[PDB]
Amino acid sequence: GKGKPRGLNSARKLRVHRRNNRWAENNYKKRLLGTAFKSSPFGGSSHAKGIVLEKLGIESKQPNSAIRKCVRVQLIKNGKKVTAFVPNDGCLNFVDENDEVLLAGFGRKGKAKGDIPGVRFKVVKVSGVSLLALWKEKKEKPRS
Amino acid sequence: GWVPVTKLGRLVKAGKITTIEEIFLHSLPVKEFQIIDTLLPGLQDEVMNIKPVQKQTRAGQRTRFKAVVVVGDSNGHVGLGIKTAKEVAGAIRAGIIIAKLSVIPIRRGYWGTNLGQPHSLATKTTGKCGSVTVRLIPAPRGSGIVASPAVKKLLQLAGVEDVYTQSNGKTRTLENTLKAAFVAIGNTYGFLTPNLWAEQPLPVSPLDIYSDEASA
């Protein structure tokens, strides 16, 4: 009779089986355990501000030979270390030292983006000015 | 010139059968394409995709192109052909030829109240090819053919204005979903409906009646 019970008074069995098999998915368990609240670096938020600690020259994965020009920052609200990839060409000259940066995700819902290993975040704004306006010379970086 | 070799081809060359409906009425095997584009001059062709197929040998990889062609006129008659060939233009050429030999009719019906001309299918129907199942459901007027654009092209070449489609399986395989859709539109004339419950006097074959304009 195709597995599951089909009786008119068997709704409880279907409900408890659906709960137990709902725990087998990935997004439902991630939501209900509060893993975004607990173990995420951002704490479940879309963006996060941070203080840049240093610069890294992260290699690109195989097959690709490049250096990805990332930075290591520390988040203000939690205080954990986070590697973020400075997006465009020549923008590493804008994010030098102890800057106040805004980080977002990559669009891979917390997974590594491309050939860059072990990063999850990109720098959006530095010192209150966006990197795209600085790259296109629309605005110009403030004092400190 | 044609010079057919079939009794059916000779009779349609003579002009004895003036419409294609006797062929499906008496289930005659359509055997040469010139019968089809003599009896149905209004059909157009479209080629959906050309995919390279590879046969690997000891010395390189032999390349051919598989071309699928859907032909048909926009009231009733649909054909589907699939042909692989070493040259691409021969692949569309043999594709339109094979699609001409596979012409089938469509049970077009009404979703409700039978007011005007038939716009949709008479019944729900399905087709399965490989892992792909395609289900067609009658739809109200002006709903359009809600379908992926390949099978949407197929049923707008068929003559349906509106239909609901459902799919299951690996529908990205284009040949399997086009063949499943062809089976689904072929099964419309397989279903027995209460308007067909009446008995018929079993008409005599044109292959027998006009047998002295035949091959012999």
């Binding site: 890294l56 290699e59 250096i67 020549g90 | -």
Partner: protein, 60 residues
């Protein structure tokens, strides 16, 4: 792993590119007039219809 690298090479091609100034063009009609321009130069000006209505060709 390869975490370090030559950070002095950043912005190489962006700096090495030659400055080319954007030429002065007459102003395109806008809004409804732009759609009028696209409609006229796609259908009644059907001039580039080479094999299958090719509208952005290369110089050949």
């Amino acid at each position: 792993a390869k975490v370090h690298g030559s950070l002095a090479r950043a912005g190489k091609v962006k700096s090495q590119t030659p400055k080319v100034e954007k030429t002065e063009k007459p102003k395109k009609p806008k809004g409804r007039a732009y759609k009028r321009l696209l409609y006229t130069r796609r259908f009644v000006n059907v001039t580039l219809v080479n094999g299958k209505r090719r509208m952005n060709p290369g110089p050949s």
